[PDB]
């Protein structure tokens, strides 16, 4: 249950596949308008590898549907990311998630 | 046993060094520095109130030793059950004697 | 009953006795051998007597008609000051009843359980007695002696208040005739206003030596008011008064003339109890079992200063009570911040639930992070 | 609203001031779990942006410096500070070249102390570990609640020094509104950060050569900007300066011991080589004179440590010399020991030109021009000049913590050193179920490192046995037996202590001294298996043969008083299982008595002085004996055991320990007579040539009649056939305690051996 | 120094040992002036606090025990461990007295108080006026010079049947007799200057 809405056009041809590195210099907010995570503030491009499930499934399946250079708006259902307990101390139980995600390079 | 003890020339280098330091406590423990004893109470305490002071009215500023002892008096009066170790007290109690 | 005890009660108000000679004039003169006199317990407010069969029983001040008490001193087995004879600590006087002519000693009947259990013996006026009495006297006439009659007066004025208060426990008033016997209100308000001043903590501008000297003379008296009750008593008053909720309107069926003097009486107890707890360590351990009771209220519209201060002083000394909060007391005090506004006092209290003196506890140093922190309101 | 206007509210600031105090309080003494959850809450950027900001309300953002120092550091500072006392050094080629500034020319030998702290230390210290925060990572369910938050150390180092560069210039210029409001807010929070980064050694070579330039005129210019120690300062920043100067004293001390290790390498090498040459000169080649063989005795006899004493005595001695060495290697000591006693303090008969002169001449000025309040301050500087006036005193008190090891083993020790740190952090935190798990693997990994078997001298110098001891006392501290919270960890740790006690004699002594401490809190929490503190108490003396002679009676007296308890109690914990618990508990008694067996003999029926007082003390309390015998009602010599036999095959009676009750009764009386068979007076070496020991023999012989004792060796239960028996009833394997009871008390004589 | 001793109630640790060592140095000889200052404070604070310590402390002093002597006499039989640097403790004198370096100074401190025939300490030590209770150090010290006497006379019987006293039979013996001499010196200085 993920929804994707393009914000700026990207390459539209090259898409990430298994066994490939992805760097995501993103920012993240909550459904009510508060943001609880970012990568631009730390000024370090977050990098992760698809296929080994080191990231929440909602995020990876959302990123699988976008191309290089695209900035988009992502919306995860609470059932796909930290369903019942959540991450203690940062996010309340049973909350909707909002992500501002863009991809720098490497497909 | 004493008849089977090992010669010195078969010991590993790393082990044959720790015994040297522990055994070579025969050049500090007997040597005497003296020094800090008579020069201590001379430069400290006495001649402490130098020409730095500009004026006075009724009392005088306590000299450096005077602060030290009252500190020990200060911590002595602290309401406690049993006195602690405070090796710092030992270091100065002996040199005052 | 009368007993013997070692070096435990020797610093307590229980073992204090007063000698009252039978004369009206020159009662304070020097005490000499062969002189009838009475014995009074200071905090109990009672004498010692052997009436017919019950033994050396501590009789009240109404059945001591100079024949049951009738004590005097013996060496062995005047309109002036008088000759000074009996010294302190070495006079070795022997106690003897006048009418019965007996000698006082310990029966000491000890079974197997009593020998390894209570180290207590009973004294009896035997006809011949033992050979190891040698009762010598020690003088303790100082600030503590003044704070001995206070216990009897206050403890005799408090329980009578609750007992009178307890009569109308569940009787709505028959409007008009309020009740039977009246209640004292002006007496207690003055009484409480004295102890809070009496137990007022040492000042700040004083030097170290004077501050330390009085700091020893306050901890002792705080502990001295616990061994004679007066912690249960102040607890007992809160139980009875706190039944009447809301305001003085519900307290109407107790005498509407005393209704308008409700708030201050409820207030004055709380900071009184804070005086008996602040600073001292032994008294703080008593609230481990009663922790649930104090934390319960936290809501009365006239308790704000009292409860937040009494709770603050019990989490600053004893780490033991700090370990007896499970999951619900934390959210109770959290809700306090949500209903009484932005108060820095409560936020300071939560810092007490954190690291104690040196040692830190982790069983509760996450609940506040998951309860008052994730929500961003 | 803007933060900058909270300087003009005075009520909303007060609430927010305490808020950031809670965050400092939530991050307890190491809480890497909840520490990161604050990172998403407070920041990672505006903290780094709060540094350069100047408009400051005071108790606000100036307090953020105490939050930046709490969520990224003291996760290693709190550990690395403990690492600063011991000075383990390995054999390295770099270590082979260390001296007192050997680019010195003539005067540089007796001067040019070198700037305190340059590099090359070769000390063993664990490295810092850090992790980056990421809240989009997959749900975990390894590291203790997590490793640590991260931060760009590179940016912090440059920014902090540049920030402090403004401070010195801006202080001399003066103002009517300093940064933060009043001078000290402009100094104390910023240089406190400098001190914390300094102990970790983030700064290197070039960087520290600039922090010294902040006191330029004296320390700097090895080959305007007035020093920090030039202007008047309030009574708070002066304290911090002491915290900064203190870090530099031990840096010289750490440099000092390394120089000794350098001399402790080349001089011992030639000594071993020259001693071999001394062998062949007087070896089989030899010559004559006979008595010369008597003179050459150290060379083959005496332990190796004794040889060092003889060959080293004359070297640094004066005048008289016995059995000397060649007068070629006895000259560097008279130079090195001279060189050492010219660096520290020795005179060996203006600009300070030395740290020793600088500190001593400065601290006196501070007291002469002020009456210092805040006793916490005055205790600081008075601990400095004492060190700068007694150099050798600190050195003499530092060598017992120094140790040298060899390469190819540093990697093994590195794991041990890093793993040992987590135990030290366990003491401060209160016991937690998650933390309880952590130690068990922690101690389990300690006993596999190949280094806690070869160098026991290390482990007494690090003294982990000391630290682990408090771990046991905290959990066991309780009012009664109901306070047995967190079991399965005392057993898991007490096992480690026993094996430590069985590695060397000095290891046995070092832990023996706590025997009185150990027994104070040992005979209460009884009922578990595997181990108990009583066991390690017994293992503290098992084969010493001289520790047993060094008892103090009161230790033996107090343990006996415990046994008086188990002669009248009923074991309420045992009763809690719904058991009869008639008169006493044999389970508890069998444990106390097992200890006494190890203090009556040490190696083959010896040491009687403590044995003599045991019987004379045990008789005083007759209740110590089980009430089945040695009482007023009855004795039942061959009946008390027979009564136990009747209850042995009576499942209804029993308890409807984990096996049965009759075996426990059999265990007690058999073990008691085992004690009073080896507590015998002595062998016939004394009993046949004296009259004192005969008194004891008469006593013990009068308590066990031989007529009943001879009959007790009979009636074996059965033998497996067709189906074995159970170890729950009165067996026969533990009946040999009556064999030694007659072998050394009444003994064989006539012809009763046939019977 | 009076304030430091009073704080330490009855524990003869390293605290008072390094403190009593100081007190001898201030008031060696007669030093009349320093005695006057000490008397004034005790009359001013008017708390007991201190005579409890002196009375309790000296009751924990050791005497010439005989059982502990036997423990040496066989422990000294061995000469070296299997192979570990021989007996590291070597002398290991801590047994028979382990206190002569300390208990000899406690009495010297008391003796130097009543030096120069001062007739106020010589009367104050007997009874403390005012306060609440008295201690009477005078009778509290003579009891010590009775248990020690019962110890030496006890030691004599152990050597009554021998003919020559071995070297370790004199090293400990001279330790005890030196202590007894110091005690006797004090007793005179409560009486000198009638």
């Amino acid at each position: 249950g993920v929804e994707i809405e393009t914000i700026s056009p990207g390459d539209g041809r090259t898409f990430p596949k298994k066994g490939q590195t992805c760097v995501v210099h993103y920012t993240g907010m909550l459904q009510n308008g508060k943001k609880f995570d970012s990568s631009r503030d730390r000024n370090k491009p977050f990098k992760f590898r698809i296929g080994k499930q080191e990231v929440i499934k909602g995020f990876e399946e959302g990123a699988a549907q976008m191309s290089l250079g695209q900035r988009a708006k992502l919306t995860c259902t609470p059932d796909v990311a930290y369903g019942a307990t959540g991450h203690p101390g940062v996010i309340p139980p049973n909350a909707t998630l909002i992500f501002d995600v863009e991809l720098l390079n490497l497909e | 046993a004493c008849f089977r003890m090992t010669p010195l020339y078969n010991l590993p280098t790393h082990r044959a060094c720790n015994m040297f330091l522990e055994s070579y406590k025969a050049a500090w423990i007997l040597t005497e520095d003296h020094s800090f004893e008579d020069r201590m109470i001379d430069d400290l305490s006495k001649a402490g109130e130098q020409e730095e002071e500009e004026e006075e009215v009724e009392e005088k500023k306590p000299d450096p030793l005077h602060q030290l002892v009252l500190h020990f008096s200060r911590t002595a009066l602290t309401e406690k059950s049993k006195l602690d170790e405070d090796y710092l007290y030992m270091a100065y109690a002996d040199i005052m004697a | 009953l009368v007993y013997y005890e070692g070096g435990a009660v020797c610093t307590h108000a229980r073992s204090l006795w007063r000698l009252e000679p039978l004369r009206i004039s020159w009662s304070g003169s020097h005490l000499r051998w062969g002189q009838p006199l009475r014995i009074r317990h200071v905090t109990t407010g009672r004498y010692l007597a052997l009436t017919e069969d019950q033994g050396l029983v501590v009789v009240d001040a109404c059945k001591a008609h100079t024949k049951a008490t009738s004590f005097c001193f013996r060496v062995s087995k005047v309109e002036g000051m008088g000759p000074p004879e009996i010294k302190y600590g070495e006079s070795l006087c022997f106690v003897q009843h006048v009418a019965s002519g007996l000698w006082l000693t310990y029966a000491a009947p000890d079974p197997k359980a009593l020998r390894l259990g209570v180290l207590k013996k009973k004294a009896i006026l035997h006809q011949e007695g033992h050979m190891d009495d040698a009762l010598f006297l020690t003088r303790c006439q100082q600030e503590e002696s003044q704070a001995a009659r206070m216990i009897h007066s206050t403890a005799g004025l408090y329980n009578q208040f609750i007992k009178g208060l307890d009569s109308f426990s569940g009787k709505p008033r028959g409007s008009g005739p309020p009740a039977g016997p009246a209640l004292p209100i002006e007496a207690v308000i003055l009484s409480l206003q004295d102890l809070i001043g009496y137990f007022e903590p040492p000042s700040e501008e004083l030097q170290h030596e004077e501050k330390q000297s009085k700091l020893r003379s306050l901890r002792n008296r705080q502990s001295l008011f616990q061994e004679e009750g007066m912690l249960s008593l102040v607890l007992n008053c809160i139980d009875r008064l706190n039944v009447y909720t809301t305001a003085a309107h519900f307290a109407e069926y107790a005498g509407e003339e005393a209704a308008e003097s409700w708030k201050e009486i409820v207030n004055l107890l709380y900071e009184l109890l804070a005086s008996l707890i602040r600073g001292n360590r032994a008294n703080c351990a008593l609230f481990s079992t009663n922790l649930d009771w104090v934390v319960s209220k936290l809501d009365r519209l006239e308790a704000s200063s009292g409860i937040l201060e009494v709770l603050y002083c019990v989490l600053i000394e004893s780490p033991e009570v700090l370990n007896i909060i499970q999951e619900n007391h934390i959210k109770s005090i959290i809700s306090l911040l949500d209903k009484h506004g932005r108060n820095h006092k409560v936020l300071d209290v939560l810092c007490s639930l954190c690291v104690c003196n040196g040692v830190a506890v982790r069983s509760n140093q996450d609940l506040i992070t998951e309860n008052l922190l994730p929500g961003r309101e | 609203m803007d933060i900058l206007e909270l300087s003009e509210r005075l009520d909303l600031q007060r609430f927010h001031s305490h808020t950031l105090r809670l965050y400092r309080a939530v991050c307890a003494l190491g809480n890497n779990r909840v520490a990161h959850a604050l990172c998403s809450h407070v920041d990672q950027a505006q903290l780094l942006h709060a540094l350069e900001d100047a408009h400051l309300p005071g108790p606000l953002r100036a307090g953020y410096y105490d939050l930046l120092i709490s969520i990224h550091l003291e996760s290693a500072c709190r550990s690395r500070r403990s690492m600063l006392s011991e000075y383990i050094v390995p054999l390295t080629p770099e270590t082979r070249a260390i001296t007192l500034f050997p680019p010195g020319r003539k005067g540089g030998n007796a001067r040019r102390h070198g700037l305190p702290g340059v590099g090359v230390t070769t000390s063993l210290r664990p490295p810092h570990h850090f992790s980056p925060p990421c809240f989009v990572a997959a749900l975990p369910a390894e590291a203790p609640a997590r490793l640590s938050p991260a931060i760009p150390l590179e940016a912090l180092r440059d920014k902090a020094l540049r920030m402090l560069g403004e401070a010195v210039r801006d202080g001399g210029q003066h103002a009517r509104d300093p940064v933060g409001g009043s001078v000290e807010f402009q100094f104390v929070p910023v240089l406190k950060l400098v001190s914390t980064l300094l102990v970790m050694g983030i700064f290197g070579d070039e960087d520290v050569k600039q922090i010294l330039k902040m006191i330029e005129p004296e320390v700097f210019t090895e080959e305007l900007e007035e020093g920090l120690l030039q202007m008047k300062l309030p009574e708070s920043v002066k304290l911090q300066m002491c915290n900064l100067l203190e870090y530099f004293c031990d840096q010289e001390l750490q440099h000092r011991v390394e120089s000794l290790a350098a001399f402790a390498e080349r001089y011992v090498d030639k000594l071993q080589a020259n001693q071999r040459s001394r062998y062949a000169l007087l070896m089989r080649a030899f010559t004559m004179s006979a008595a010369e063989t008597a003179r050459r005795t150290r060379e083959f006899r005496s332990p190796p440590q004794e040889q060092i004493n003889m060959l080293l005595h004359f070297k640094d001695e004066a005048d008289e010399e016995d059995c000397p060495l060649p007068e070629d290697i006895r000259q560097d000591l008279q130079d090195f020991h001279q060189d050492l006693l010219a660096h520290c303090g020795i005179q060996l008969e203006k600009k300070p030109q030395s740290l020793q002169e600088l500190v001593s001449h400065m601290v006196v000025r501070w007291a002469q021009e002020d009456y210092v309040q805040s006793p916490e301050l005055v205790r600081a500087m008075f601990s400095l000049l004492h060190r700068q006036y007694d150099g050798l005193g600190e050195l003499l008190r530092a060598l017992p913590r120094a140790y040298t090891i060899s390469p190819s083993s540093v990697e093994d020790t590195m794991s041990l050193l890093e793993c040992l740190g987590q135990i030290r952090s366990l003491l401060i935190v209160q016991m937690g179920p998650q933390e309880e798990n952590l130690m068990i693997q922690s101690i389990g990994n300690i006993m596999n490192n190949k280094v806690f078997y070869q160098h026991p001298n290390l482990m007494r110098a690090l003294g982990m046995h000391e630290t682990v001891m408090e771990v046991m006392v905290n959990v066991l501290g309780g009012g009664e037996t109901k306070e047995i919270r967190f079991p399965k960890m005392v057993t898991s740790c007490c096992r480690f202590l026993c094996y430590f006690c069985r590695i060397s004699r000095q290891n046995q002594r070092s832990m023996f001294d706590h025997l009185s401490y150990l027994l104070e809190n040992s005979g209460i929490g009884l009922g578990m298996q595997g181990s108990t503190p009583l066991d390690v108490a017994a293992a503290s003396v098992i084969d010493n043969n001289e520790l047993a002679l060094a008892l103090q009676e009161q230790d033996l007296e107090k343990v006996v008083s415990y046994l008086a308890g188990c002669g009248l109690q009923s074991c309420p914990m045992l009763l809690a299982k719904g058991y009869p618990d008639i008169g006493w508990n044999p389970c508890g008694g069998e444990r106390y008595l097992d200890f006494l067996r190890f203090a009556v003999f040490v190696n083959g029926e010896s040491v009687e002085e403590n044995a003599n007082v045991v019987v004379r003390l045990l008789i005083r309390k007759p209740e110590c004996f089980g009430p089945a015998l040695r009482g007023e009602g009855g004795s039942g010599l061959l009946a008390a055991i027979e009564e136990a036999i009747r209850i042995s095959e009576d499942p209804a009676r029993d308890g409807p320990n984990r096996v049965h009750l009759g075996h426990a009764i059999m265990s007690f009386y058999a073990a008691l007579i085992d004690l009073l068979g080896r507590c015998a007076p002595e062998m016939h070496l004394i009993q046949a040539g004296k009259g004192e020991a005969l008194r004891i023999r008469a006593i013990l012989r009068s308590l066990v009649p031989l007529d009943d004792l001879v009959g007790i060796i009979s009636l074996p239960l059965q033998i497996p056939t067709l189906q074995p028996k159970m170890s729950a009833s009165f067996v026969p394997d533990h009946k040999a305690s009556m064999v030694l009871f007659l072998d050394r008390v009444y003994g064989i004589e006539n012809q009763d051996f046939l019977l | 120094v009076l304030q430091m001793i009073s704080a330490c109630k009855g524990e003869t640790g390293a605290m008072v040992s390094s403190t009593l060592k100081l007190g001898i140095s201030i008031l060696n000889g007669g030093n009349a002036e320093v005695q006057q200052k000490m008397l004034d404070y005790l009359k001013d604070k008017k708390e007991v606090g201190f005579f409890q310590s002196i009375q309790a402390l000296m009751q924990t002093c050791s005497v010439l025990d005989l059982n502990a002597f036997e423990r040496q006499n066989k422990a000294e039989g061995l000469g070296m461990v299997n192979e570990d640097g021989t007996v590291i403790n070597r002398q290991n004198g801590e047994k028979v007295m382990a206190d002569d370096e300390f208990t000899q100074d406690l009495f010297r401190f008391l003796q130097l108080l009543c030096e120069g025939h001062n007739n106020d300490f010589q009367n104050y030590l007997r009874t403390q006026t005012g306060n609440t209770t008295t201690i009477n150090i005078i009778i509290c010290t003579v009891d010590y010079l009775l248990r020690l006497q019962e110890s030496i006379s006890d030691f004599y019987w152990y050597y009554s049947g021998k003919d020559v006293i071995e070297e370790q039979g004199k090293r400990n013996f001279s330790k005890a007799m030196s202590v007894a001499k110091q005690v006797f010196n004090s007793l005179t200085e409560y009486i000198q200057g009638p």
Side-chain angles (χ1 to χ4, degrees), chain D residues 49-50 149 167 200 276 403 406 460 715:
Chain D
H49 169 272
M200 301 205 167
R276 296 187 184 96
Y403 198 108
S406 88
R460 292 183 291 113
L715 191 83

Side-chain angles (χ1 to χ4, degrees), chain C residues 342-344 347 350-351 354-355 359-362 365-366 368-369 373 376, chain D residues 14-15 18-19 21-22 25-26 28-31 34 38 41 428-430:
Chain C
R342 268 182 258 263
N343 190 344
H344 68 276
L347 183 63
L350 284 196
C351 295
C354 285
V355 65
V359 65
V361 62
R362 304 231 181 91
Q365 183 62 255
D366 62 342
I368 62 156
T369 71
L373 188 153
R376 281 159 174 77
Chain D
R14 184 251 291 291
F15 190 91
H18 289 108
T19 299
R21 176 196 307 294
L22 192 63
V26 175
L29 278 298
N31 211 343
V34 299
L38 306 181
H41 266 279
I428 62 170
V429 65
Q430 197 275 326

Side-chain angles (χ1 to χ4, degrees), chain B residues 1 73 76-77 80-81 83-85 89-90 93-94 96-97, chain E residues 3-4 7-9 11 14-15 18-19 21-22 25 41:
Chain B
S73 277
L77 269 297
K80 200 37 70 177
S81 62
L83 294 174
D84 291 331
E85 191 56 350
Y89 170 74
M90 314 272 180
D94 273 338
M96 293 180 183
Chain E
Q3 289 192 356
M4 209 59 188
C8 172
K9 280 73 176 175
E11 281 75 60
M15 211 46 48
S18 193
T19 295
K21 194 63 51 63
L22 183 52
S25 294
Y41 179 89

Side-chain angles (χ1 to χ4, degrees), chain D residues 538-542 546-553 556-567 572 574-576 578-580 582-589 591-593 595-604 607-611 613-622 624-629 631 633-634 636-641 644-645 647 651-652 655-656 661-666 668-673 675-678 680-681 683-686 688-706 709-713:
Chain D
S540 46
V541 68
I542 205 173
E546 71 186 40
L547 275 298
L549 286 181
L551 265 296
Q552 283 303 10
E553 190 277 331
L556 294 174
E557 201 295 329
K558 184 258 192 172
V559 61
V560 161
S561 315
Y562 276 3
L563 189 149
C566 65
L574 183 63
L575 169 60
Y579 292 167
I582 50 158
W584 52 275
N585 64 337
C587 295
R591 304 211 211 300
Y592 292 135
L593 188 153
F595 166 62
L596 282 183
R597 184 61 161 300
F598 290 105
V600 176
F601 78 99
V602 62
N603 200 295
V607 176
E608 76 279 16
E609 302 87 323
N610 53 3
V613 310
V614 160
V615 294
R616 184 171 290 71
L617 184 47
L618 191 146
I619 178 164
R620 296 294 86 193
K621 314 312 211 73
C624 295
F625 303 124
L629 61 83
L637 276 297
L638 286 174
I641 306 98
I645 297 169
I647 320 297
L661 285 188
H663 183 306
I665 298 284
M666 191 295 268
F668 183 30
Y669 284 165
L672 191 150
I673 308 284
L675 169 77
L676 271 173
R678 275 193 86 79
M683 73 291 291
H684 282 346
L685 188 149
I686 298 90
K690 186 180 289 293
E692 190 276 331
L694 321 173
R695 173 208 314 280
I696 297 90
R697 180 166 62 94
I699 303 292
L700 59 93
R701 185 179 289 173
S702 49
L703 311 163
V704 285
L706 188 153
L709 188 153
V710 65
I712 212 168
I713 61 170

Side-chain angles (χ1 to χ4, degrees), chain D residues 139-141 143-153 155-157 159-161:
Chain D
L139 188 152
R146 273 152 61 230
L147 182 83
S148 281
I151 193 66
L153 277 297
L156 271 173
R157 162 192 53 201
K159 176 189 282 187
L161 266 75

Side-chain angles (χ1 to χ4, degrees), chain D residues 25 67 117 123 172 208 238 247 274 368 438 475 600 689 710:
Chain D
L67 183 63
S123 162
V208 295
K238 306 167 79 74
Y247 168 89
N274 197 294
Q368 292 180 351
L438 183 63
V475 298
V600 176
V710 65

Side-chain angles (χ1 to χ4, degrees), chain D residues 67-93 95-98 100-104 107-108 110 113-141 143-153 155-157 159-168 171-172 174-176 178-188:
Chain D
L67 183 63
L68 183 62
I69 193 66
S70 179
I71 297 170
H72 297 313
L73 301 153
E74 82 175 20
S75 294
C77 277
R78 184 131 40 90
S79 66
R80 251 192 185 265
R81 203 161 300 84
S82 314
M83 291 335 307
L84 294 174
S85 194
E86 54 276 26
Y87 311 135
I88 297 98
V89 65
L91 188 153
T92 61
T95 314
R96 304 187 65 88
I98 280 167
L100 188 153
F101 194 110
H113 295 285
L115 277 298
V118 294
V120 64
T121 180
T122 62
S123 162
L124 272 297
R125 297 292 209 285
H128 319 73
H129 294 88
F130 288 128
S131 84
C134 289
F135 304 72
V136 305
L139 188 152
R146 273 152 61 230
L147 182 83
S148 281
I151 193 66
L153 277 297
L156 271 173
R157 162 192 53 201
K159 176 189 282 187
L161 266 75
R162 186 193 73 245
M163 178 158 49
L164 186 140
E166 293 179 353
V168 296
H174 297 64
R176 291 190 300 111
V179 176
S182 58
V183 64
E184 61 86 10
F185 291 167
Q186 188 274 330
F187 274 137
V188 65

